[PDB]
Write an enzyme that holds these catalytic residues in place. Structure first.
Site, PDB file in Angstrom:
ATOM      1  CG  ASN A 167      -4.801 -16.377  -7.075  1.00 35.00           C
ATOM      2  OD1 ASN A 167      -4.255 -15.115  -7.008  1.00 35.00           O
ATOM      3  ND2 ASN A 167      -3.893 -17.118  -7.007  1.00 35.00           N
ATOM      4  CG  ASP A 201      -9.163 -14.156  -8.215  1.00 34.47           C
ATOM      5  OD1 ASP A 201      -8.777 -14.140  -8.699  1.00 34.47           O
ATOM      6  OD2 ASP A 201      -9.210 -13.438  -7.138  1.00 34.47           O
ATOM      7  CB  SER A 205      -5.506 -11.749  -9.347  1.00 31.30           C
ATOM      8  OG  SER A 205      -6.283 -12.305  -8.046  1.00 31.30           O
ATOM      9  CG  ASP A 259      -1.337 -15.045  -5.400  1.00 28.05           C
ATOM     10  OD1 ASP A 259      -2.014 -13.814  -5.409  1.00 28.05           O
ATOM     11  OD2 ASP A 259      -1.060 -16.192  -5.207  1.00 28.05           O
ATOM     12  CG  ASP A 312      -4.983  -5.839   5.374  1.00 29.18           C
ATOM     13  OD1 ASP A 312      -5.902  -4.544   5.348  1.00 29.18           O
ATOM     14  OD2 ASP A 312      -6.762  -6.204   4.669  1.00 29.18           O
TER      15      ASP A 312
END
Length: 129
Positions: free
Chosen positions: A46, A48, A50, A52, A101
């Site tokens: 991604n 940012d 990070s 997946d 969550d």
């Protein structure tokens, strides 16, 4: 491992996703489709920084550790390589954590956009379950 449709249904159901938190077995086998294309070793960076990882594409910033995303939380307490194995266990165990969550299955943008609302049942069609 690139899972079969009726193979990933069986394995997900066995690990306890069918109806987990009110989500039908089709919800899960629709998310996996548009997230990883039934490939366990599906990885996607991604913007940012990070990544997946896996059959469900679980984010390294919150859920798992990859040692390349400062601000990693590792709330599932696993290395993100755990999430690419042919054993969907670690994926499913973490996924139980995410879909609990708060925003439920909305945590997976593919599911929000391409599964939510649709005839999810069509994903467990033909599966001897």
């Amino acid at each position: 491992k690139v899972f079969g449709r009726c193979e990933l249904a069986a394995a997900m159901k066995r690990h306890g996703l069918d109806n987990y938190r009110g989500y039908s077995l089709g919800n899960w086998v629709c998310a996996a489709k548009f997230e990883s294309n039934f490939n366990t070793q599906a990885t996607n960076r991604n913007t940012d920084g990070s990544t997946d990882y896996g059959i469900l594409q679980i984010n390294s910033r919150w859920w798992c550790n990859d040692g390349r995303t400062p601000g990693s939380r590792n709330l599932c307490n696993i290395p993100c390589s755990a999430l690419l194995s042919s054993d969907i266990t670690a994926s499913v165990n973490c996924a139980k954590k995410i879909v609990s969550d708060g925003n439920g299955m909305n945590a997976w943008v593919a599911w929000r956009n391409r599964c939510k609302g649709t005839d999810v049942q069509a994903w467990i069609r033909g599966c001897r379950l």
